[PDB]
Amino acid sequence: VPLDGGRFATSDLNDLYRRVINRNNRLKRLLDLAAPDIIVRNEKRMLQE
Amino acid sequence: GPEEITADIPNVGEAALSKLDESGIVYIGAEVTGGDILVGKVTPKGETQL
């Protein structure tokens, strides 16, 4: 929801699923790029977190 | 926004102002009941909503 003035009074539910997906799309990107193991796997670390 | 007491008072007519003098403040011995207004308080609104 918008805040009077020009800001946002949002419940972090969004700011976590956004994270679940920012990281998620970046992960699929990192695989089309075919980056080395431990790096894209460190990405799956961030996916499970 | 710098607040002013009463000044601009919408959502009512002049019936409520029968006890809200030339200052928009309640009388010197009124019979306020139910849901009337004691003193007028003004506050600004918002960018995103206009």
Alpha-carbon gap: B43 to the closest alpha carbon of chain A (Å): 12
| Residues in a beta bridge with A8 | A2
Residue A29, both tokens: 């990107």
- Give the sign of the dihedral formed by CA A15, CA A19, CA A25, CA A30: positive
- The technique by which this structure was obtained is cryo-EM
- Work out the end-to-end distance of chain A between its first and last CA atoms, rounded to an integer number of angstroms: 27
Q: Which residues of B touch A (CB under 8 A)?
A: 45-49
Q: Give the position of tokens 């956004």.
A: A18
Chain B residues with CB-CB distance to A6 below 8 A: 47-48
Rounded distance, CA B4 to CA B24, Å?
10
